Amino acid sequence: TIYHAKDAVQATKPDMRKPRLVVFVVGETARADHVSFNGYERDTFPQLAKIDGVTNFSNVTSCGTSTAYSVPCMFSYLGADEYDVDTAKYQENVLDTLDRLGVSILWRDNNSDSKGVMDKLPKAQFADYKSATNNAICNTNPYNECRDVGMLVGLDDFVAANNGKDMLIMLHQMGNHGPAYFKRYDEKFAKFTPVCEGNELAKCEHQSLINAYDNALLATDDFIAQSIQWLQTHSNAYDVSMLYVSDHGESLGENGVYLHGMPNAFAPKEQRSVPAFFWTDKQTGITPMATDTVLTHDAITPTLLKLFDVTADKVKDRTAFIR
Template sequence: MKSTAGKTPGSTRISTWTVSMSRPLLTLVVAVWLILFANLPFWRTIWSGINGWSNGNPGFIASLPLFALMWTFILLSVLAWGRLTKLVLAIALLVSAAVSYFMSSFGIVIDSDMLTNVLQTDPAEVRELITARMLGWIFVVGVLPALLLTRVRITRRSMGRELAMKLASVVIAAACIGGIAMTEYQSYASLFRNHREIRLMLTPSNLVSAVHSYVRSEFKTPVKLEVVGADAHRIREVGVNRRPRLTVVMVGETARAANFGLDGYKRNTSPELAREGVLNFTEVSSCGTATAVSVPCMFQDVGRDEYKPEYAKNREGLLDVLQRAGVGVLWRDNNSGCKGACDRVPTDDVSHLNLADFCANGECHDDALLSGLQDYINSIKDDTLVVLHMKGSHGPFYSKRYPATYGKFTPVCDSSQLDQCSRQSIVNAYDNSLLYTDHVVAETLRLLKHNQASFDTALIYLSDHGESLGEGGVYLHGLPYAMAPKEQTHIPMVIWLSEGIKDHDGIQGQCMAALENQPWSQDNLFHSVLDLMAVQTSVYRPELDMFHTCKAVNQASVMSVDSAARIN
């Protein structure tokens, strides 16, 4: 350590100090810090996965910190080169501190889907997450050690010797990993096989992997927009003068079936819908566990098994097909956007409107989605689909999602620091948000009923994904689908059909009621809406249409010669 001191006239004595280190040693020190202080969730999961001290294999237990340290050292060595070494290491410290905070506080893991979800979060949601506790955590775990890096003087060596030392240190670290893997192969194989989430928890390795996957997906060679349903057209019936069709699809946010009153929850969180005679489907699964995946996926025709993230921007969806067929389309948004699903159709963002009744502090409650909607309906002359993208129960600040008049369940967690609130207060705030969602959906339904004289109307409400409320120490959503708990994938779905649509299409109410407890998913939305809007296309799959089996036997429409020719 080198210390220097000096005096200037009229000033106090100023002391500075520096520490000399080689780049490999500095990288190793930072790796040790990250392993010790930025990976608490990782070590908790490891300790639980190996059954703690009862594991019976002290060699395996002792090797775990060394394995993680050597892996992190290699990663940092690959990223940090030359004069950028300290800058790269400082960034790694800061970012790792932020990642470790959210992993520790909410029980999340980091993969490309979670990174996408974070990058598409709007500024209002970001502000909700910034707390004194978060800033304190980042300061202690990230900022302080990053500042200490400024006091390190890198030992100067020739480029050749510098490269030789880096290569040698990486080879030694890799040899340690290889030796551990060979001697404890069975123990490690069992650990990673039974706890696949571990690879998504080691920081900053998980973040580097997520960034790599995200960049590879976002910046791959652009592809031409894939057209879907090029032959789409509306069925034109001969000699029938029917009313225009008006269907509203309400995309909820973060509503889970476990807390939905109509699905048997102990609290009546859906009292208004219960009085409206809706069809309630109790076994519905989402396409993903985050908005960035589920919203574009549910509007595609391929289903969850074949959906790819790039489809959100590079492939047409339901709204494109309907618009091509001549159906009017409008997307109204009170969330963070449609994630590609509405890129080529008219949109209306209500999330930043200055509506005194619904908006305050830069955020609008979901009643804002209905503001001016009747005026829009009055202008409709033909078949139309309206999508209302709700703010719903978006966490972690559930108590901000509803007006005070819907605060039925108390006390509530009035904070975004969920791990600092009692579980009951979290559930209370969340249930209040569902109570308000119930009101907004019911209000929309009543609006459609009011317009039945002019339109054949229908409403579909389904959430984009569910939510964890602290079960097993997990909060929010976004876990990889394969490891996500049911609370994040089991969602509510409600459908209401006017008598006009049921009579015209021959949809039998008793048949539909018999399907309420059957398994459904967001895969059914695309094909069911095509049916509701009387749109024919070769990509339509009747087996995924929720209404198909409940139509009167041999119910068919007589088409014009031109329409039949296009199909053939």
């Protein structure tokens, strides 16, 4: 494995200050321009809007347009202009660094898998939440599809087993994954009707396609809010923060393009303009950058290092989501 941060050091330890507990929601297929906070005409994030201390970032560009390309890039040290999807899984990434420095790393996945990111770490630190063998929240819809909120169940058991350590929990969302947006949310989120079903996206009425997409964002709004609420139940003993970034956006019929994964060279705006949210408890001393900072997926790795008081020369100058 090719290293990049063997110099990384943790400036303060959880035995000499409050331990730190962070949830990083790795979002899926969410577009920046369908976020209420970014000027969308629909209130797609009602529950997040009621939580104080949430920063919305209005100018975030993803590293790529697919899950397989963007997810490794989000945890990489190389940045988007130097990232190589084909050698990514042999590079030291930010989670390798934090685990080495003693931060407890957990990856729960309701999407696919970590696309190589967790591969160097013990397998017990990755959990498949697409199956009812782990996910207790699957029988809430006619499809029996397991839901992102199920990834929150039993996180206290993980906290208990890591009592007093710093902890970083990745929750990899099913989110807005298509083509079957109508399957991605339970009935209580079916606010926008009528809804496109079936996989022939270009054949649906355009408004019905958007309606299904926006309904899935409502379910993601709920999941993120529930994630912050769960963190709040540990705010006494832990410095708690939540970072959300989507892996890429989605085309919804613009110029006849649907889904995503188009090469960066011809990729439409809509596939790379992603939402990002950051929440932290006022106790932590973490300060967000301005909501309108020009940001990319390159900001993720310095953000996670700063959240755990880790410095690494490779990303010393890099802009993060936080100061």
